[PDB]
Design a protein around this nucleic acid. Structure first.
Ligand SMILES: [Mg+2]
Ligand SMILES: [Mg+2]
Ligand SMILES: [Mg+2]
Ligand SMILES: [Mg+2]
Ligand SMILES: [Mg+2]
Ligand SMILES: [Mg+2]
Ligand SMILES: [Mg+2]
Ligand SMILES: [Mg+2]
Ligand SMILES: [Mg+2]
Ligand SMILES: [Mg+2]
Ligand SMILES: [Mg+2]
Ligand SMILES: [Mg+2]
Ligand SMILES: [Mg+2]
Ligand SMILES: [Mg+2]
Ligand SMILES: [Mg+2]
Ligand SMILES: [Mg+2]
Lengths: 97, 99, 110, 139, 243
RNA sequence: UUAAUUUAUUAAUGCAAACACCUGCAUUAAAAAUUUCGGU
RNA sequence: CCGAGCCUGGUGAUAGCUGGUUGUCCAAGAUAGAAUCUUAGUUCAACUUUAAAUUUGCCCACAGAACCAAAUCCCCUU
RNA sequence: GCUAAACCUAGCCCCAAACCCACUCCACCUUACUACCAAACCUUAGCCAAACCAUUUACAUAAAGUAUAGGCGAUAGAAAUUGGGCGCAAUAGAUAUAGUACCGCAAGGGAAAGAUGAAAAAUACCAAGCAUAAUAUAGCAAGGACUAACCCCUAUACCUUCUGAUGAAUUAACUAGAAAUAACUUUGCAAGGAGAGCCAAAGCUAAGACCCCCGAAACCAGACGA
């Protein structure tokens, strides 16, 4: 059917462990540190999208203009494909016109 | 426990490796080490020869001025010529209208 | 930005003022601006919606509301259409009665 | 709009607000009143972009204005010149060229730019006769 | 996932990689610089900044380098820097019409020169513009001495320049046998484009030909380890002689 | 297709360029190429 | 499967064409004109409905509303 | 009761960093997996959008989406200068169990599934259909009722174009609203707002909210087929 059969694995999760303990510690970095470095650098994440959060089409546009010459050919053709798709997607057919 | 201490600044201005193939051209050129000097003084920088412009660049700037800056007397003479021409045109138009 | 240098007469040449010392013993309490003026502002919305507000109110703000209605009572006759922002610590009156309200706060001195 | 992009834009400085900053202490009168003074305390801001002109005095209501100053704006009214001189001001009008004005107005960054100090070029021919006449109390 | 270094220098990446990276540093420089020549059809604009025509605004403007459509056969001779142009055009040169793809091909002529530096007559196709270039250089040897190989834009002329450079840096009597006076007179005349004898190694060859010169240069019969161990034992005997 | 329009391309000329070959410009065709064959 | 082979990419091709488009509870809310290579669609047009600002509306009684029938409109009071 | 169900965990997901792959002996461009005689570059095209069609059209931050250009009809488009998890868990995610079986003359297209326990030298009930038990006059199978299952009385199968006829055997799983410009509301500041620019004659910053899914025949490049 569509249910489980027994009670599932017991969710051993310590909500108070170290790798979550400092979650945002030293993360008011800018005005609480005499303006040396903004929070706009403290994020450890991909350089395609580290803090210019536009739309989906914008997301891909930034991915291209940042790292396109660093992809295998499948990713380049893929990013080009969806970029063409989205450029057609924005201004063609929708609810508000 | 207690985390590693928060991010600090970089240890002064660092020149890049000119051998490094990854560096963008924006921070390894002529004015870039100038920006490095403007960051860390002469204290970390180099000899201030980058501060003054080049003699070839000096001749280029002179050419830029010669093709981009007249003298006030020349402008005054052009204004006087334009005013004289405007007065003559106005007098001719008034004479044509009167006749 | 520091506090202004002393212009000897009051009001100033353009009419700025220092807040009076000591502050009055009124439970309505007004702070001034970071750039040091009397905290009164307009409000524009919804095409014809003109209103105004005093922003940094503190204390028993309902007394300030009653006082604003009382000052407004001779001003337009109708009862004042006003709402406080108790968490935000503000008072707002429907309509722009702005310069006279600044005068009322100035005559209050604090 | 044909020449909207070639149209000059000059920031109008409310001289009543100059009196305010005089009273509020944003710009003290103990030293010269320059664009350095006009920007440095955030009383009225400039925008280098949009093909702008610079700082120029405003024209309304010099009643109750008691101070001594030395104003250096791009343009002003004859009434503004008389306004300065009524208490005995100093009024001068040079140009401030685009790169030059942009360097001048926010002096913090170009002080750490690293290039040597540029020098202000003379105004263009249209702006030349404006500065050439002392009736504007110019430079 | 993503590839670390950029493919925009991937070819350049291989230029620092291996056996080909053991090529001469002069060859590295000659394949490294990219100085542009004077155009065949892109007439140069005046200066850096100029007044706008319809706007009257001082704007800085550059000029477009039109790509030289070089057919392969023109590499087999000494053509000029000219060639064909593969582009398009309008019927009345009017942009409001349906344009069609078009070509601008050169008119060559099979001529001959007789170089004293080569001391031989070579007959090949050239351009009347190339004829004018040689005449302005006043001699084919001086022209070979004059223009850059990147400015040459031709394989055969580059090869001729390589040969002329090798002859000049060689100063062998076989250039002018039984006439050393004419040889000395030409060497004084051709003293301008003197190059080192080492510079004749990778002179003007293909990058593939550069790899060829490498494999012809870096290869050798490997040293015998009988001979190597014999030399090591001789070194040990010499050291123990002091013991 | 003799609807329209060209002519990217050939083939001719003629004119240029060089001293039979190549390139450019016009015209002409052949062949193409672009676009039309409405409603009650 | 020959009326123009098959396949991969381009290709999420394109037509204004059909259909289907996911749980609840309160407040309001249904038919007038004109354009359009257009009536299978869209745009000026009206109604709404909501948000704000400003005090009388619907039902009517006298007078009045044209020369070549029912009437209808403006229309004090209730 | 049987068929069945259910179970984690294989490994995939994106990123971070980092430059990687290629010699057991052998053989391997002829009919590839056999030890042996006299030749390469030559402008991508095209639709789409113009509500038809034609010129035109894509295959770090900031100025600035301003200067350039448009059957001046749709839009496209700068330099100067300045500086490890709010991913999955066999129908989902790489199709992945393998680019294999099979299909096709080839180029190609491209599937499916398993679940034990520390030990294998330890061999508890449910989707639907059925029997466990077949049926009782009559009619959208139900409701009000009842001593009482039905016989008693009312009772035009659902979703939807319509103005009042197409689909769905039945399960169980997948499967379809994300562009914030303006305005508003709610917060922080206030003649300045905001961590260079932008705007301001009460504004300026932060967030919030509007934008589907399926479905043509087309056409061009590049191969492959007698
Ligand atoms: Mg407001
Ligand atoms: Mg596809
Ligand atoms: Mg579709
Ligand atoms: Mg249709
Ligand atoms: Mg019409
Ligand atoms: Mg028509
Ligand atoms: Mg129609
Ligand atoms: Mg269309
Ligand atoms: Mg740029
Ligand atoms: Mg799977
Ligand atoms: Mg799969
Ligand atoms: Mg059952
Ligand atoms: Mg019945
Ligand atoms: Mg439904
Ligand atoms: Mg059926
Ligand atoms: Mg189809």
């Amino acid at each position: 059917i569509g249910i489980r059969l027994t009670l599932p694995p017991p969710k051993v999760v310590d909500r108070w462990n170290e790798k979550r303990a400092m979650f945002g510690v030293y993360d008011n970095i800018g005005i609480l540190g005499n303006f040396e470095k903004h929070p706009k650098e403290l994020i450890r994440g991909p350089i395609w999208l580290r803090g210019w959060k536009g739309n989906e089409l914008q997301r891909c546009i930034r991915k291209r203009k940042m790292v396109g010459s660093r992809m295998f050919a499948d990713d380049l053709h893929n990013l080009n494909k969806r970029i063409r798709y989205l450029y057609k997607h924005f201004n063609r057919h929708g609810k508000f016109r | 426990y207690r985390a590693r201490p928060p991010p600090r600044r970089r240890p002064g201005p660092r020149w890049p490796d000119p051998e490094d193939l990854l560096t963008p051209r924006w921070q390894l050129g002529p004015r870039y080490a100038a920006k490095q000097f403007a960051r860390y003084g002469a204290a970390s920088g180099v000899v201030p020869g980058s501060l003054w412009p080049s003699p070839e660049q000096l001749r280029e700037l002179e050419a830029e001025e010669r093709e981009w800056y007249p003298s006030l007397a020349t402008m005054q003479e052009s204004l006087r010529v334009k005013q004289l021409a405007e007065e003559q045109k106005r007098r001719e138009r008034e004479q044509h209208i009167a006749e | 930005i520091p506090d202004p240098p002393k212009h000897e007469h009051y009001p100033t040449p353009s009419g700025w003022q220092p807040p009076r010392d000591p502050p009055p013993n009124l439970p309505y309490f007004v702070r001034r601006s970071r750039m040091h003026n009397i905290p009164v502002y307009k409000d524009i919305t919804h095409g014809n919606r003109q209103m105004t507000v005093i922003r940094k109110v503190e204390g028993d703000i309902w007394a300030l509301q009653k006082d604003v209605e009382d000052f407004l009572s001779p001003l337009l006759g109708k009862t004042p259409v006003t709402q406080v922002n108790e968490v935000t610590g503000t008072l707002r009156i429907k309509g722009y009665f702005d310069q006279e309200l600044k005068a009322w706060l100035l005559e209050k001195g604090f | 709009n044909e020449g909207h992009s070639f149209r000059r834009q000059y920031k109008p400085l409310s001289l009543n607000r100059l009196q305010y900053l005089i009273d509020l202490g944003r710009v003290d009168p103990s030293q010269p009143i320059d664009l350095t003074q006009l920007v440095n305390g955030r009383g009225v801001t400039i925008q280098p972009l949009k093909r702008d002109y610079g700082v120029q005095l405003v024209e309304e209501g010099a009643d109750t204005f008691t101070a001594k100053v030395n104003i250096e704006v791009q343009l002003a009214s004859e009434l503004a010149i008389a306004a300065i001189e009524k208490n005995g001001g100093v009024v001068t009008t040079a140009f401030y060229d685009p790169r030059s004005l942009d360097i001048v107005c926010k002096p913090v960054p170009f002080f750490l730019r690293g290039q040597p100090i540029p020098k202000r070029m003379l105004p263009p021919e249209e702006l030349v006769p404006y500065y050439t006449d002392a009736k504007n109390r110019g430079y | 996932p993503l590839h670390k270094y950029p493919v925009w220098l991937w070819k350049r990446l291989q230029l620092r990689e291996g056996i080909c990276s053991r090529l001469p540093g002069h060859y590295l420089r000659s394949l490294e610089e990219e100085r542009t020549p004077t155009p065949v059809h892109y007439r140069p604009h005046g200066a850096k900044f100029k007044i706008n025509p319809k706007n009257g605004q001082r704007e800085r403007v550059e000029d477009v380098p039109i790509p030289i459509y070089f057919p392969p056969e023109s590499q087999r001779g000494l053509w000029g820097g000219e060639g064909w142009i593969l582009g398009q055009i309008y019927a009345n040169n009017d942009k409001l019409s349906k344009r069609l793809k078009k070509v601008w091909k050169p008119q060559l002529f099979e001529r001959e020169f007789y170089s004293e530096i080569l001391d031989k007559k070579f007959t090949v196709t050239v351009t009347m513009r190339t004829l004018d270039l040689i005449d302005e250089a006043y001699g084919l040897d001086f022209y070979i001495l004059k223009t850059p190989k990147e400015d040459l834009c031709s394989k055969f002329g580059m090869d001729l320049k390589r040969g002329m450079l090798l002859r000049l840096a060689r100063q062998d009597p076989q250039l002018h046998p039984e006439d050393p006076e004419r040889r000395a007179a030409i060497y004084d005349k051709y003293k301008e484009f003197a190059i080192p004898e080492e510079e004749a190694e990778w002179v003007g060859l293909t990058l593939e030909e550069a790899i060829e010169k490498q494999r012809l240069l870096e290869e050798k019969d490997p040293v015998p380890l009988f001979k190597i161990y014999v030399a090591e034992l001789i070194q040990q005997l010499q050291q123990q002689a002091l013991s």
